[PDB]
């Protein structure tokens, strides 16, 4: 019917951080996953629950695309059943996730001389998130038990901390753009049949 815009998600002009990650709905279109599969422009392309080759011959009820920017080491934490700061307090994939995770290097785009501090991430929290939840809160996190009344000090820190992306950093400390495609299939009418 209509070829749907993978171009607005993959070749976007701007991406968002990992604490406030962008989620966009894909509905009533025909998708071409073969373009994405052997594009050989993606560092990692890993699909859980569906085999990567048989994706086109399958129909889905609702498909979601989430986008953010992470570090090079942290891409392994974007997977079902892993721990770390990103997997605990930033982006939690369930233990039954049906979908794909894509990440590719963006040092050409996302890094600058003098550094680029505009991609942020949350480091502390009071609990671990359950799957597919977003926390945008910017409240001050106390570590101990003494109050600090909305102002930082001892044992009270800001929860958000900023990335620093320089052109000269190593592979592990370089920016990676991540798109997570989440599929859900149930007994409703269809929306995305390639």
């Amino acid at each position: 019917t209509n070829l749907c815009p993978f171009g607005e998600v993959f070749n976007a002009t701007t991406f968002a951080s990992v604490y406030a990650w962008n989620r966009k709905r894909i509905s009533n279109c025909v998708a071409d996953y073969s373009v994405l599969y052997n594009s050989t422009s993606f560092s990692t392309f890993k699909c859980y629950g569906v085999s990567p080759t048989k994706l086109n011959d399958l129909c889905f009820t609702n498909v979601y695309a989430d986008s953010f920017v992470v570090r090079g080491d942290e891409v392994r934490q974007i997977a079902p059943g892993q721990t770390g700061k990103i997997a605990d307090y930033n982006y939690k994939l369930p233990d039954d996730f049906t979908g794909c995770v894509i990440a590719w290097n963006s040092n050409n785009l996302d890094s600058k001389v003098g550094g680029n501090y505009n991609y942020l991430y949350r480091l502390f929290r009071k609990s671990n998130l359950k799957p597919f939840e977003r926390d945008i809160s910017t409240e001050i996190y106390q570590a101990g038990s003494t109050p600090c009344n909305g102002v930082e000090g001892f044992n009270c820190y800001f929860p958000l901390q900023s990335y620093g992306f320089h052109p000269t950093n190593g592979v592990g400390y370089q920016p990676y753009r991540v798109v997570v495609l989440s599929f859900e299939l149930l007994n409703a009418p269809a929306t995305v049949c390639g």
Partner: protein, 595 residues
């Protein structure tokens, strides 16, 4: 919540916030080094004082959590590291004048001008000439003149400062709950809280001396040989039984005996191995040297070099429009940024210096997965040890035949073997008595068993019982020769060299035992043996995470520095020295004098 978790949260935030400031200060200082200009000095010291202020505030905030409640030892190590007060302990005026003393002593040592009496219109520094005179002269009286003039002048100019420098540093030590500044220096080897591996700060002494005895039988005989041949060069001043004078040994101080390979060669009519001509014949360059360097390490089973290493580093002097300082250095800038700075030339010596530096870089790559504060060697000797045992393997005839530099028809015999062992001995075994004596004297001046009125006396009264070098000009207490050396004048530790030598030969013995090598040990090469590579990596990745006693027991099978590998490495030399001195006088007596 227990202070257990509060401290860990503090440390986590600290690591994530400190990595970045480290990286910026690092890149600033790098760009200054590879391009000298006042603007870059401005950028450098700005970023630096930012980083220093950061660490000061972090420590003054970290002092709060008391470490009698923490049981996890990594947390205790990190908090102890971060808790150290530093020179911020003492009062404002004391810190002011102490920093001023340090800076002025360094400056005055670096700006020494000595002037000869025959040409008062031409006066010369230390580092270009003075060093050249005393290294490559064959004249007695002129060398004694240069030596006496330099030592007398700068020693009398420096001693009044160092004198109470002593007590200021001692109180700075004492405040932080120590007996003497020597204890603060020795604390780098301290380990407690792990049963079976504790190491008191005093134990080191009781070790370093207990080793030195075993090292004297080999040393004594060498000191005979070096003396006997020297009798032929200056046959009007030296004694058949006495000690060597000071102005006959090469460098200004005698820190090494490498400058005497000309007058003390075993078999002179035989040339050594030097592949400079073989390199310029095949038109090598910097890229080829460093490629072979990384190839050696890939053979042993270690990582390759980062792409940023090839892109951003400077492996050639960049010409005359751009200046630089090209002391060979291996840079860890953080965030996975590893580089090398070197003004390379196509020579044999740089072929080994490249291996030394890449060994440094490999250590830094190995411990990069540890917390920020635990990113160093186990103690202050391990970096240099791991750097040296690589040149030691790459400098054999076997590896050089493998690389294709020497034609495979180069046959070696017992004369060239003894040549290599002697050239190694001069620079390795000859630096140990000097090192041990120097730091023993510093420890005794700091602990106070050498009253002021006797200081210089016991200095020489040590040189005659340990090193066996007598002073050509008599000195009273108005002289101060130990303050002349760069390391002592500018507050650096000095036992790192002794422990480095010992750990170095222990590592070599262990590795090229597990690497399936039989024969004399100075022929062993670890090229193409992944078994030894993993045994080394299981020590490299730890960093300061766990006591150095275990870090060493992993690789050598022992918990303390031992000399049997070193004495084993020099046994082919010991056997020949015993027969060469079968007739000559071995040892020395203090009953001789040069004046």
């Amino acid at each position: 919540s227990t202070i257990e978790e509060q401290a860990k949260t503090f440390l986590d935030k600290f690591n994530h916030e400190a990595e970045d400031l480290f990286y910026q200060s690092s890149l600033a200082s790098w760009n200054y080094n590879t391009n000298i200009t006042e603007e870059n000095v401005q950028n450098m010291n700005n970023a630096g004082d930012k980083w220093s202020a950061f660490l000061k505030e972090q420590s003054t905030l970290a002092q709060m959590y008391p470490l009698q409640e923490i049981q996890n030892l990594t947390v205790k190590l990190q908090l102890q590291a971060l808790q150290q007060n530093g020179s911020s302990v003492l009062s404002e005026d004391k810190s002011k004048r102490l920093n001023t003393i340090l800076n002025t002593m360094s400056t005055i040592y670096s700006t020494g001008k000595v002037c000869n009496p025959d040409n008062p219109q031409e006066c010369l520094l230390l580092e270009p000439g003075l060093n050249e005179i005393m290294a490559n002269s064959l004249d007695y009286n002129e060398r004694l003149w240069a030596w006496e003039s330099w030592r007398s002048e700068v020693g009398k100019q420096l001693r009044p400062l160092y004198e109470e420098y002593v007590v200021l540093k001692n109180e700075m030590a004492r405040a932080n709950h120590y007996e003497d500044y020597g204890d603060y220096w020795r604390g780098d080897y301290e380990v407690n809280g792990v049963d079976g591996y504790d190491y008191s700060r005093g134990q080191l002494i009781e070790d370093v001396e207990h080793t030195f005895e075993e090292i004297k039988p080999l040393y004594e005989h060498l000191h005979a040989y070096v003396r006997a041949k020297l009798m032929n060069a200056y046959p009007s001043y030296i004694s058949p039984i006495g000690c060597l004078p000071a102005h006959l040994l090469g460098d200004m101080w005698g820190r090494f005996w490498t400058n005497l390979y000309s007058l003390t060669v075993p078999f002179g009519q035989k040339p050594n191995i030097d592949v400079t001509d073989a390199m310029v014949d095949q038109a090598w360059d910097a890229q080829r040297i460093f490629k072979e360097a990384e190839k050696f390490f890939v053979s042993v089973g270690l990582p390759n070099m980062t792409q940023g290493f090839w892109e951003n580093s400077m492996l050639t002097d960049p010409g005359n429009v751009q200046k630089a300082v090209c002391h060979p250095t291996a840079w860890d800038l953080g965030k996975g940024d590893f580089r090398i700075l070197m003004c390379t030339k196509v020579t044999m010596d740089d072929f080994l210096t490249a291996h030394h530096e890449m060994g440094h870089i490999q250590y830094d790559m190995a411990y990069a997965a540890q917390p920020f504060l635990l990113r160093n060697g186990a103690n202050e000797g391990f970096h240099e040890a791991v750097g040296e045992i690589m040149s030691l393997s790459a400098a054999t005839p076997k590896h050089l035949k493998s690389i294709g530099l020497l034609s495979p028809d180069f046959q070696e015999d017992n004369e060239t073997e003894i040549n290599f062992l002697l050239k190694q001995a001069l620079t390795i075994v000859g630096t140990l008595p000097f090192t041990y004596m120097l730091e023993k004297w510093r420890w005794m001046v700091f602990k106070g068993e050498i009253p002021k009125d006797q200081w210089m006396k016991k200095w020489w009264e040590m040189k005659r019982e340990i090193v066996g070098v007598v002073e050509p000009v008599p000195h009273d207490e108005t002289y101060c020769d130990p303050a002349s050396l760069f390391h002592v004048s500018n507050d650096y530790s000095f036992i790192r060299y002794y422990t480095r030598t010992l750990y170095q030969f222990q590592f070599q013995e262990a590795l090229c035992q597990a690497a399936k090598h039989e024969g004399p040990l100075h022929k062993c090469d670890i090229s193409n043996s992944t078994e030894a590579g993993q045994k080394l990596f299981n020590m490299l990745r730890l960093g300061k995470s766990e006591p150095w006693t275990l870090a060493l027991e992993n690789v050598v099978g022992a918990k303390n520095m031992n000399v049997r590998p070193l004495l084993n490495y020099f046994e082919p030399l010991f056997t020949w020295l015993k027969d060469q001195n079968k007739n000559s006088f071995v040892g020395w007596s203090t009953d001789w004098s040069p004046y």
